Amino acid sequence: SAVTITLKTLQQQTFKIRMEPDETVKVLKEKIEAEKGRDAFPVAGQKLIYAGKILSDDVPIRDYRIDEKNFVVVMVTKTKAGQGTSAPPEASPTAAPESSTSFPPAPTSGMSHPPPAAREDKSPSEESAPTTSPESVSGSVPSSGSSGREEDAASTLVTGSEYETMLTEIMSMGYERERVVAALRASYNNPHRAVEYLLTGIPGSPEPEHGSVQESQVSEQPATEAAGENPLEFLRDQPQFQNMRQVIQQNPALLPALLQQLGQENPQLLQQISRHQEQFIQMLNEPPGELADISDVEGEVGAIGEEAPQMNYIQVTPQEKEAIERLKALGFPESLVIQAYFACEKNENLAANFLLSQNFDDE
């Protein structure tokens, strides 16, 4: 089964083909190259005219309803393949009916498209909507409520190590590594929400109330009987250290010249300087000691406290000491206060109250 096709070329040369009554016209373009040949029948200008509109090569033959009784004026122009056929400048025009008049610039650009008459020049939006799919607008329940995303706060601490830089900001407290980021991924990657939701809120510390740290044991010296036989204080006051603390306050070359001259003459300190070279020298340039903390002067000049180890008959307690502390702090005596306290009701007036009325000023 088949069907001959009337092929007509603009050159006035017609013939006949056949192929199948359902082959893409693309085979036609190639059928013409073999039907007429390839001397002056290229493909670029291959337009199969059957009655005005050239049949394209994207449809199967017989789809345009061609008629063998008629003829298809196929065209074969447009020869742009690098180097093919061309035309010299000396020639005559053959477009009587199709005579060119305007001079539209093919190359270059330009927006030649003026609107007809004087109406709405601009054209915002349109006035039609051709649906592409047959059943696109379907369904009913919402699945993705995308009514505006969320930016929230992210660049709050993340740096070179982003969350790791913060991981050290919190972990340093004494936490872990994976538990902290998790605390910094659900609380707000911050030491505020993470901490609160790191142990007291995170599933890692159910009511952490068993870590009492109210000890404060950093400074608490007795200073009541801790001094005797010290190879360092006798020199600090003797001429040995004075020569090492005076020569050092002008030239560091004397330190060695002295440590080897006097510092290396008395074994009383040498047996310690070998291991105390750090502290012994620390005092050579800056000896410790201070007689003015902030205001050592409540009563008159300011004493130290109890400078009598095993001397009095009692030792006061944490109940009456408050009365004496404020007494000697206002300008009261010493033994006259610790004793007079037992005036009438062991109060802070009968004993003081009468003491003040007895001091008076002048009559």
Dist. CA 26–CA 266, nearest whole Å: 117
Rg (CA), the chain: 56
By CB neighbour count within 10 A (0-12 exposed, 13-18 middle, 19+ buried), where does 177 fall? exposed
Chain-centroid distance of CA 99 in Å reads 71
CB atoms < 10 A from the CB of 272, how many? Answer: 16
Chain-centroid distance of CA 165 in Å reads 9
- Amino acid, single-letter form, for residue 157: L
Taking each helix axis from N to C end, the angle separating 267-285 and 239-246, rounded to the nearest 10 degrees, works out to: 40
- Closest by Cα among 49, 66, 51, 58 to 9: 49
Query: Max Cα separation, the chain?
Result: 155
Classify strands 72-77 and 5-9 as parallel, antiparallel or unpaired.
parallel
Cα angle: 210, vertex 213, 214; to 5 degrees: 120
Dist. CA 278–CA 266, nearest whole Å: 18
Q: What determination technique applies here?
A: NMR
Q: Are the C-beta atoms of 198 and 170 separated by less than 8 Å? A: yes
Q: For the chain, what is the total number of helices (H) and then of strands (E)?
A: 11, 5
Locus of tokens 């009337």 = 6
Contacts within 8 Å (CB) and 24+ apart, 230-236: 231/268, 231/269, 231/271, 231/272, 232/269, 232/272, 232/276, 232/279, 232/280, 232/283, 234/268, 235/266, 235/268, 235/269, 236/283, 236/287
Dist. CA 5–CA 55, nearest whole Å: 13
Cα angle: 358, vertex 360, 361; to 5 degrees: 150
Dist. CA 318–CA 303, nearest whole Å: 19
Locus of tokens 């995303």 = 149
